[PDB]
Amino acid sequence: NSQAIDNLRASLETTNQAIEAIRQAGQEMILAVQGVQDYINN
């Protein structure tokens, strides 16, 4: 029914948003490892 389709779409859009937040966490973790490498080399 239209509520079931709306809820599946809304859940999947929310899930996609959650995955983007995890992707951003990954970028920050990479910056942290780069900062460890810079500290060792410097």
Binding site: N7, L8, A10, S11, L12, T14, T15, Q17, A18, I19, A21, I22, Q24, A25, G26, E28, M29, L31, A32, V33, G35, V36, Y39
Partner: protein
């Protein structure tokens, strides 16, 4: 002498904040599905 210490806590803190934002969004996705 060097008074500098290694400190990547701001990037690691930012990463934790984003993993936590993600957790709340996954719980909201599940709430919509259960409904």
């Amino acid at each position: 002498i060097s008074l500098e210490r290694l400190d990547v806590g701001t990037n690691l803190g930012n990463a934790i904040a984003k993993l936590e934002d993600a957790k709340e969004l996954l719980e909201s996705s599940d709430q919509i599905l259960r409904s």
